Each structure stands twice: as C-alpha cells, then as structure tokens.
C-alpha cells in the first residue's frame, strides 16, 4: 500500500490529473479487460494504480495510446 | 542540542520538511510522537500542591 | 493585478501555503482564502 502519493505526484505532477488517471486505470482494473502490471501484493486496484504510475508505467499519454492499439486491433 | 520547548520541536518538523520531503517528515513525526509519549511517561512528572 | 480574465493566474498567486511547490490550476484558492481569515476571529478579542 502507499501510504503518500507523492511519488505518484512528481511523476505526473498536477496533484490533481493524477487523480484522474489512477480513477481510470482502476477502473479499467476493476469493470475488467485489464491485469495489474505491477505484482499485485493483496491490496485493492486503487493503490496498484497509484503504484504503477509511482513507477512511472502508466501515464496519460501511454495510456491512450494503449487504448488506441485495442481500438486498432479490433 | 537544545531544550525543544514546543517551538524548536516545531521548527524541526519545518526544517525536516523543507530539506527532506514528505515521507520522511510523516516518519519523523510519528517516532517523535512515539518516544515523546514514552519518555513523558517513564518521567513521572505531577503537578502538587 | 492578475489581469487575466474570469480567475487568477498561477505566478500571481504565489505558491500554496499547504504544499512547498507552486500552486497547480484549477484550485479554488477564493474558498481557501475566506476560511484562512475567518478561522481566527472566534478567538479575537473583541
Ligand atoms: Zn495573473
């Protein structure tokens, strides 16, 4: 778990689009059609979200480029 | 290497967080807490009459 | 002396008091302002 998100923050730093981000990657974790990229280590899709872009793996452009590449493949 | 008479505890918590970040403000602020709860304790200090 | 239109620009408004970096867009620094003044004032003399 992440008790401070300012890893998170610096990464993508607004503060508040990394809010937005972690809501759409959690999402996309959670209705389904997405697996963690970062091993999962029994918490909930919130903080793997705020972890994998604390690692800098997801951002906002790669994000819709991957979802462009599924829209492509379909 | 001071008396921390809750003004230079303070200013210790600001310099830890200009200097240092975040995280390691939030962890030296909770082992403050905790050692200061310890040794308030272990002191006795009472008030008399 | 912002000079901007319908808000405030972010150099203008220094950096937030709550965090040490500048402030970021879109935070409602209107609300923050009125509760900062009129948090004291339940313990002014009168
Ligand atoms: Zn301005």
């Known amino acids: ?74 | 290497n001071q008396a921390l008479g809750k003004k230079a505890i303070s200013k210790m918590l600001n310099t830890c967080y200009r200097i240092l970040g975040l995280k390691p403000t939030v962890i030296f602020a909770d082992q403050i807490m905790y050692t200061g709860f310890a040794y308030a304790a272990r002191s006795g200090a009472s008030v008399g009459i | 002396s912002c000079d901007t239109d319908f808000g405030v620009c972010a150099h203008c408004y220094g950096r937030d008091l709550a965090r040490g970096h500048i402030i970021n867009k879109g935070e409602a620094i209107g609300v923050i302002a009125a509760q900062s003044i009129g948090e004291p004032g339940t313990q002014l003399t009168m």
């Open chain 1, 1 to 74: 778990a992440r008790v401070t998100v300012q890893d998170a923050v610096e990464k993508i730093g607004n503060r508040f689009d990394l809010v937005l981000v972690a809501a759409r990657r959690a999402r996309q974790m959670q209705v389904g059609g997405k697996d963690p990229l970062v091993p999962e280590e029994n918490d909930k899709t919130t903080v793997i979200a705020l972890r994998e872009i604390e690692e800098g793996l997801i951002n906002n452009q790669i994000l819709d480029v991957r979802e462009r590449q599924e829209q492509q493949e379909q």
